[PDB]
Design a protein around this ligand. Structure first.
Ligand SMILES: CS(=O)(=O)N[C@@H](CCCCN)C(=O)NC[C@H](CC1(C(=O)N[C@@H](Cc2ccc(O)cc2)C(=O)O)CCCC1)C(=O)O
Ligand SMILES: *[C@@H]1O[C@H](CO)[C@@H](O)[C@H](O)[C@H]1NC(C)=O
Ligand SMILES: *[C@@H]1O[C@H](CO)[C@@H](O)[C@H](O)[C@H]1NC(C)=O
Ligand SMILES: *[C@@H]1O[C@H](CO)[C@@H](O)[C@H](O)[C@H]1NC(C)=O
Ligand SMILES: *[C@@H]1O[C@H](CO)[C@@H](O)[C@H](O)[C@H]1NC(C)=O
Ligand SMILES: [Zn+2]
Length: 696
């Protein structure tokens, strides 16, 4: 009584080859489920982490290579542009023959780079202002420095767009790096070395005298400046509550309550915002409503920038943009980034060019490329089976509301309302395949030259930013997908109350219409519950059924939610990551994701129980001394088989809101009595602690 189909056999082979049965499931289920895989594999030199997700993504890149590399006589314009963009990206010979000349032509348009200019104060400083300088990088090239001003959705009115003002990203992975001691020292050194390397190459190409001490001087003041900005930014721990983060006020209020003296001139928030919004012929007045997400950061920023000069600021300003462009120039400029890349990611080589390019074209033309990917690699049968699964999971979540003892009736009724209102996106939007006109018009304003790769990417920055700035006065399009189809992930949008499962993730081990149900539920089923539970975690719970930031919790049910979720904070916060140097995981910044991982797996299991009840046991897999309840957990754990480079473990433990894959498995299964039941785990074994956390 065993399944012997071709599809059952591949499932079993993959499961057996990846697992390590000589480990005890109740001592360490990560090694039991993934020991086989870890011993067989080594992280590629071009990868910072490697595992099931990464392999499936590199596989997806191959499909994109196949469909992008050969032009076809039947291609529509939208497709012709993507292939032309791919071909310009992979030429490399054409790119190298241009040296840095594409960058030199661009620097005059961002008020130059003082370290690589001569008499910068007389050329630009005369007609230079913080308002104009920051605005030019924001509105034309989408680079947000010092002050990140962007157009987004209104958290308290998900139909409109509003102007947000938030603290900017930093050159290094996180503010923690700017200690520049111990584990962050090498990264800080490579970063400033990276500055000087680029500054030297530009001056060399401009035939300018090179004063090595003057280079070190200016570029180290840039680091002492970004150190200050970095220390002024808010922690992620202090940005977890969207209610407290949402501070709406007019531009007049901002001028009163958040002034800035920069290079003597008083900063004008009305001149800064109009310098940006004029890029699309839009006028702004002092009565404009603005949402400030980092007011604390703006106040600490006032006495930082009074100290520095227009030159000192612009040296950091342009460096943040040049930082990203050297990779798109000749190999002399590409190489200047090596020591910095290795410090942050551990990688000794750069990803294959065709792999980089396929990803770039997919990231900028995601509907045109999604069309090519689904036509070549996606079934269509799959779309309807997943709808069925999302229906089963959504109901298990509602069903489970009644069993929850820490919520009162009125909060449960409103929790059920939001759940029923969740909008689902499966596979791909049908009109990217059927409506050729709509797709061509998405890219009509774009025109790519094949020998001019650098000019193409600049076009895409301006197009990407111009289209976002134009959204200020228009309503949120509801039909829009939050992700392309050629993506191996899934997403939830609190502003839209929308879960999405692109075609890229609807393949094994996650899902297949031909693999055992125990695997589907433990795979895509757990992912579906995970995305659903995002609408109810420490952040998504603040949004109602329409994407509006509004309290719908009773004082008691809110207080209890915090109480229940504090267990998971301490659990994961007590995990030490050997790869990150024994550092502890940040249980606060990972809470939302561990809630989703724990609720999601719970919802999937109860959906597989409900299925067995209505349908019964399916046949077991060959070569596995495991029943289907144990197969459920095995496949769920094998979704996360992976490992990190030490350099990137240090990076991700600060910047990744997810737990590392190994601790997602252990933390989640430690809180699951059903796992311990399935694997008959002793009490207080490592995988079955008597104290177990639970929110959803
Ligand atoms: C506003 S937003 O929509 O953009 N919010 C993001 C927040 C995180 C961004 C990361 N892109 C979001 O929802 N992201 C999708 C992500 C999907 C899941 C996930 O874990 N995916 C991992 C995949 C991975 C990759 C490499 C590796 O070695 C190990 C694992 C990941 O991406 O790291 C898929 C299974 C459950 C969640 C989620 O739901 O959080
Ligand atoms: C790369 O660009 C050069 C210069 O424009 C051109 O001669 C060459 O044919 C291109 N390569 C390919 C494969 O088309
Ligand atoms: C970092 O910011 C805090 C808050 O303003 C301040 O008290 C502290 O002195 C700053 N640290 C440095 C090194 O400037
Ligand atoms: C902003 O001020 C500058 C003078 O510093 C001026 O040239 C520019 O036109 C102003 N921009 C707007 C949009 O008012
Ligand atoms: C570890 O767990 C204990 C017990 O709840 C808790 O007091 C402590 O804060 C946790 N450690 C971390 C780093 O979260
Ligand atoms: Zn998540």
């Amino acid at each position: 009584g065993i399944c012997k189909s071709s599809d059952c056999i591949k499932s079993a082979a993959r499961l057996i080859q990846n697992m390590d049965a000589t480990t005890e499931p109740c001592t360490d289920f990560f090694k039991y489920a993934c020991g086989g895989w870890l011993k067989r594999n080594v992280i590629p030199e071009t990868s910072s982490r490697y595992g099931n997700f990464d392999i499936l993504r590199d596989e997806l890149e191959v499909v994109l290579k196949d469909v992008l590399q050969e032009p076809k006589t039947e291609d529509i314009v939208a497709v012709q542009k993507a292939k032309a963009l791919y071909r310009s990206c992979i030429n490399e010979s054409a790119i190298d023959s241009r040296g840095g000349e594409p960058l030199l032509k661009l620097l005059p348009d961002i008020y130059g780079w003082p370290v690589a200019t001569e008499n910068w104060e007389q050329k630009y400083g005369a007609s230079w202002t913080a308002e104009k300088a920051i605005a030019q990088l924001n509105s034309k090239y989408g680079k947000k420095v010092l002050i990140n001003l962007f157009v987004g959705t209104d958290d308290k009115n998900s139909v409109n767009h509003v102007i947000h003002i938030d603290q900017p990203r930093l050159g290094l992975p996180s503010r923690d790096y700017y200690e520049c001691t111990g584990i962050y020292k090498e990264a800080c050194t490579a970063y400033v070395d990276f500055m000087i390397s680029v500054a030297r190459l530009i001056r060399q190409e401009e035939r300018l005298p090179i004063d090595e001490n003057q280079l070190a001087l200016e570029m180290n003041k840039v680091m002492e400046l970004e150190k200050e900005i970095a220390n002024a930014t808010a922690k992620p721990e202090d940005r977890n509550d969207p209610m407290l983060l949402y501070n709406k006020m007019t531009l007049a209020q901002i001028q009163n309550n958040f002034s800035l003296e920069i290079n003597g001139k008083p900063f004008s928030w009305l001149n800064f915002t109009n310098e940006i919004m004029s890029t699309v012929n839009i006028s702004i007045t002092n009565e404009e409503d603005v949402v400030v997400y980092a007011p604390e950061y703006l106040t600490k920023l006032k006495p930082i920038l009074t100290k520095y000069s227009a030159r000192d600021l612009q040296n950091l300003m342009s460096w943040r943009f040049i930082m990203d462009l050297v990779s798109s120039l000749s190999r002399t400029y590409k190489e200047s980034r090596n020591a910095f890349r290795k410090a942050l990611y551990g990688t000794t080589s750069e990803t294959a060019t065709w792999r980089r390019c396929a990803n770039y074209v997919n990231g900028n033309m995601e509907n045109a490329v999604g069309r090519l990917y689904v036509e070549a690699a996606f079934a269509g049968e799959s779309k309807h089976v997943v709808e069925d699964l999302i229906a089963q999971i959504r109901e298990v979540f509602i069903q489970t509301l009644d069993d929850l003892t820490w919520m009162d009736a009125e909060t449960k009724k409103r929790a059920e309302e939001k759940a029923l209102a969740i909008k689902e996106r499966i596979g791909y939007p049908d009109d990217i395949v059927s409506n050729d006109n709509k797709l061509n018009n998405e890219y009509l304003e774009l025109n790519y030259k094949e020998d001019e790769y650098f000019e193409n990417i600049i076009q895409n920055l301006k197009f990407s930013q111009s289209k976002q700035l134009k959204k200020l006065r228009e309503k949120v399009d509801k039909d829009e997908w939050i992700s392309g189809a050629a993506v191996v992930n899934a997403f939830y949008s609190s502003g839209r109350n929308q879960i999405v499962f692109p075609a890229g993730i609807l393949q094994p081990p996650f899902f297949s219409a031909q693999q055992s149900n125990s695997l589907n539920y433990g795979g895509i089923g757990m992912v579906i519950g995970h995305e659903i539970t995002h609408g109810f975690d420490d952040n998504g719970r603040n949004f109602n059924k329409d994407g509006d930031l509004v309290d719908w919790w009773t004082q008691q049910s809110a207080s209890n939610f915090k109480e229940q979720s504090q267990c998971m904070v301490y659990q994961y916060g007590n995990f030490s990551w050997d790869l990150a140097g024994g550092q502890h995981l940040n249980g606060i910044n990972t809470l939302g994701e561990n809630i989703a991982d724990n609720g999601g797996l719970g919802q999937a299991y109860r959906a597989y129980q409900n299925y067995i009840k209505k349908n019964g046991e399916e046949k077991l897999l060959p070569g596995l001394d495991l029943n289907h309840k144990q197969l459920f957990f095995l496949n769920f754990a094998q979704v996360w088989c992976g490992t990190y480079r030490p350099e990137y473990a240090v990076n991700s433990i600060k910047t990744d809101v997810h737990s590392p894959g190994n601790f997602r498995i252990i933390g989640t299964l430690q809180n699951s009595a059903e796992f311990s039941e399935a694997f008959h785990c002793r009490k207080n074994s490592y995988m079955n602690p008597e104290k177990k956390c639970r929110v959803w």
